Design a protein around this nucleic acid. Sequence first.
RNA 1: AUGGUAGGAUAGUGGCCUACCAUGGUUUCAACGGGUAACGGAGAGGGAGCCUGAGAAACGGCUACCACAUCCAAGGAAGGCAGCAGGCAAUUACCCAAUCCUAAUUCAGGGAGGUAGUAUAAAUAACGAUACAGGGCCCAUUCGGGUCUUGUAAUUGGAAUGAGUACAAUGUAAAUACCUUAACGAGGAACAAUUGGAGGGCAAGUCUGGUGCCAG
RNA 2: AUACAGUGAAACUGCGAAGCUCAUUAAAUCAGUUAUCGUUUAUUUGAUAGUUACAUGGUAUAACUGUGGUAA
Lengths: 255, 716
Amino acid sequence: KIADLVLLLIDGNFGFEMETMEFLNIAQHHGMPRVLGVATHLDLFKSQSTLRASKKRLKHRFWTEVYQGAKLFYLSGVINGRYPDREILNLSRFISVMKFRPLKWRNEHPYMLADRFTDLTHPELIETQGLQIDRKVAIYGYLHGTPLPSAPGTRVHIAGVGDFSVAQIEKLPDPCPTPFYQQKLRKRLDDKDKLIYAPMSDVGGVLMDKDAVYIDIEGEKLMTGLQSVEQSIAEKFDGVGLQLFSNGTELHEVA
Amino acid sequence: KKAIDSRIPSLIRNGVQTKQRSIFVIVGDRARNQLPNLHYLMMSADLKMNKSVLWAYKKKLLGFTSHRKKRENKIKKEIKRGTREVNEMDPFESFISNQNIRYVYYKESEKILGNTYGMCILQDFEALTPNLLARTIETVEGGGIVVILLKSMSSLKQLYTMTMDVHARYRTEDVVARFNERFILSLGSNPNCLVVDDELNVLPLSGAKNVKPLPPKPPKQLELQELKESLEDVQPAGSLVSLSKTVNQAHAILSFIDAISEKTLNFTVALTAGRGRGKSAALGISIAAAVSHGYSNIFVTSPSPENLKTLFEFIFKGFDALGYQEHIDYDIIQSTNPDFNKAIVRVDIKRDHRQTIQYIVPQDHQVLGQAELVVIDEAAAIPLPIVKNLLGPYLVFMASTINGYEGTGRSLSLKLIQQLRRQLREISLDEPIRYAPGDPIEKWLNKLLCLDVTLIKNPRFATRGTPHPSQCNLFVVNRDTLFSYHPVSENFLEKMMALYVSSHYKNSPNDLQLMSDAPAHKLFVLLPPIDRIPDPLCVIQIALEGEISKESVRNSLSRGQRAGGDLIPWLISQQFQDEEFASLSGARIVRIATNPEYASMGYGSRAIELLRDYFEGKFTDYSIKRVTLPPLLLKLSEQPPHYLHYLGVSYGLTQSLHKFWKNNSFVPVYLRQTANDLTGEHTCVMLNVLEGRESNWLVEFAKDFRKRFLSLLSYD
RNA sequence: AUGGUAGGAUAGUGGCCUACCAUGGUUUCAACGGGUAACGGAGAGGGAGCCUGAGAAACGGCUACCACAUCCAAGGAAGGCAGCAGGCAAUUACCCAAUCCUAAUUCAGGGAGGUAGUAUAAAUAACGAUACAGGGCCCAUUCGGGUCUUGUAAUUGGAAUGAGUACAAUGUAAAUACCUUAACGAGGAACAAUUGGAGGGCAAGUCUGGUGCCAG
RNA sequence: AUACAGUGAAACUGCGAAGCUCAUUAAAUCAGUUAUCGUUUAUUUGAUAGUUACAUGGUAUAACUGUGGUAA
């Protein structure tokens, strides 16, 4: 009900499955979006003749569900967890040039996909009442469809949850500023401008879940020595006294 | 997937929530690879933070270059050679790839003063200087992160020795680098400082050992939003006050508007604040208010027009708030002089009636007869006689910086206020615009650099009365102890710093390096009679200068960098070309500071007299352990004096100082022809010969200087 | 412009150009000019200029000018992409073997070149045996007339082989494809081609109008 | 291999670098043929120069060693 574009993975060796066409019927029944078929596991074929025949049967059947002449991609195998570059490059141009038809359902209501999830309930309330207590939650993301009214109290549904009312609404600057927008604040896209923003996913090497963050990665003796230090430097200062004069008493703390 | 120590995510999240900055110290060869992660953690905490990154380095970049096509040209080369995959690009490269990083040298720290950066990364620990610290840390925003990269092995060894025992200080094979050792110990005292390794393990020596995550969410903003809402209908006040970021400067802008409304030409408005508190925004907004009010001839004066760029920018923002449009309502005129770098000089405004804003050199006060308003920015840098001439029968706005750039001593501002006591209106801005008030790092930066130190009147002196000149005896100060960061030594250290700053005209942050690390400098304190931390009454900073420094110089040239210079021997050489004087061992009194309140009773003279006897021999190992602390002060008899031939002074020629040195048996040898631009005074070098040493050469120099002086009365 | 004398330049002839001299040259036997199914010569961002070499006013390089536009610490640097290929979307992968060539050359290379990638003939079936029943078909507006081995919506038997499943060799620069060729491969032969048309008939079913049991 | 002698990065020498897109033009394009005693011509091929020396100089530097500037 929300996917503007869909990439449909079909096991070429095995063929179509229930979970595929059911989405097509659900997509057919809630507003057909742009539908792109990608065929995989084709390297499993041992003969070229059966591969071509299998490709022909699959592409024609994909033309029954989706408009005849629909674009269907074919992927052979996976190397280093990566598909062949060119077929992966070929689909780049298609997705870039796709224009999307106006859908009645999507163009009349506001919707937005949760980029990240955060619970704002005070930890003290979680303890004095217990975990059972209802939780204050903040959900972030980009708005789609018709504009969302600025005044709070708007009624909104969350799939698999129930109906809630918007307690508070505020706009934040863009986490993933598009190139024409970022530089604003026939020419190819500059590779600096290309950006990736994924809060929940691990981008680079850092993954964040709940409030704990996870990352992947003579001097060595000294570092273990520093790490094993117990007393704080401020505490060590307390013990230190200084002689103001050569024969004067050690003065510890100024009154 | 390792779980990072929970202390680091809590500190970054806390500081963002309270709008406080944070310091991180990363130790390790792979230290650079953690900056991407630490930089990513920023936006996750809060997205609104500034994404621009400041990074300072001395000469070379850690493992890369700051030009793009070379990186792309190289990355193409590894891919084609096959060493790297076609699309492989590490996180450290990714951090540099997409973020806006400003590459800056340590020497050119002046350029970064105005701009605002979310994060500052400091490459080199050894080359750190107070100006490079005060300047860079001030450019970080509230919730920002400061990082210092202690990658050097010698720094790594230095950290080990202090942590194992604070008493022992690691020392390599003449620079002692005590301040850098202070920087380490002080970093521990900061509550919002975490020192970490390349594996993101929080080393325990940090002060931020118990930083706990604060609960989810200021009164300052409430007092500001209400004020803006109340004044929205009242133009031009509403639009101009809307630009205010803070409560105090909004009051200052309102106070300026009141002065503009009063129309009294004998009125004086003095704006005093620290650097980064938004004086220029207040002054620029106030100027825009005068244009809308109806003032025609508006003047602006400063030591150079280049410093006024930030002011004129904020005037135009005020003009935008007031509905003025460029090329229709006003025109901007830029300088044709190459020295001013196309700095804006004049703004002509045509709405209602012809109004003009124009820059003037401070010396050109004769044009001010027609001035309705002059705005004097950075009056601390202008000579006192000149600013007196600038105080004409017209409205005057003054912005003077306390502890900004070179600025001036606090007492000099106080002397200016006493003179004004012409109606005087005083405005003070205390609360910063860039971060939360009372940020630990500013509190921390102040104690390390002692910028915010203030002189205090001592009640016990009043009860006992002022000590007679004869009673006190001079004490030598041990630098290692004074520079150990003990609370007693720090509080003792502050007291000299107060006397250091208050007395004389100009004081740069880098001076605290010069007293600390350089060996030739020795500190003398004129303490009261011993009968509590002793309170200094006069402080003399002297530099050994002559043949004795030559051994140090030769070592410096062996290193490949000449360190410092011998001022007086060089001047006397270029002037008289006397080979003997260079060979002669002598001492230069770099500075002699006395309490302004107790001036004229003779503290300065006796300390010189006691100093003169000490080096004359009339009064006839304290080094810290090198990988329990020795006494803080050493008596004159306890330390042998070095053999000296003369005592020298260098100071701006003034009648009060010249009389003071004339009474102390000092003889003039030279006077600079060109006036120091900031003071307008002529530098003079005066010498005094000690008993038991030849005095013929001074007499010959004195004869020449008079004949030089006599003919040069006319020229300059 | 036609020509002579002399000179300048070319690799050289020559108004090709230069100084003087004569007023000439083509043409109603079609000069000159116009149209055309005369695809039946030019440049590499735009003009000007230079440089190399046997051969280029060079799809090479250099100078100034006119515009485009990139990076930057704003002090400078550099580009010819002002391109190419597409739509109103995969032009890729393998080679110098085969025909040829450039070179300090047998051997190096050539996106010259080559290799591969993405309307025409067949099959869906053929041959028997048995059992059980008397109706099957043709003509005719009309009434009726004409003719004889038939129907199965019944049971059953042994043979044949193609698409597929595929071991090989051959083929080739190698490889795909082609040709040839072991084993397996059918009764719902479910190993389950369609498209269009003409008629039916059925309910404790529904509706509408009537001269009941009717009609639509 | 007691001058080096196999192979050989780099550098100095030698040789060769000579499809597309727009416009359009009547024997001024092009085709056939003549002449160059009016010319240039790498290369191929055949001929062709009797008119300190038991071997001269850096009047020479690259590659190379090392010191640096620059955002580049």
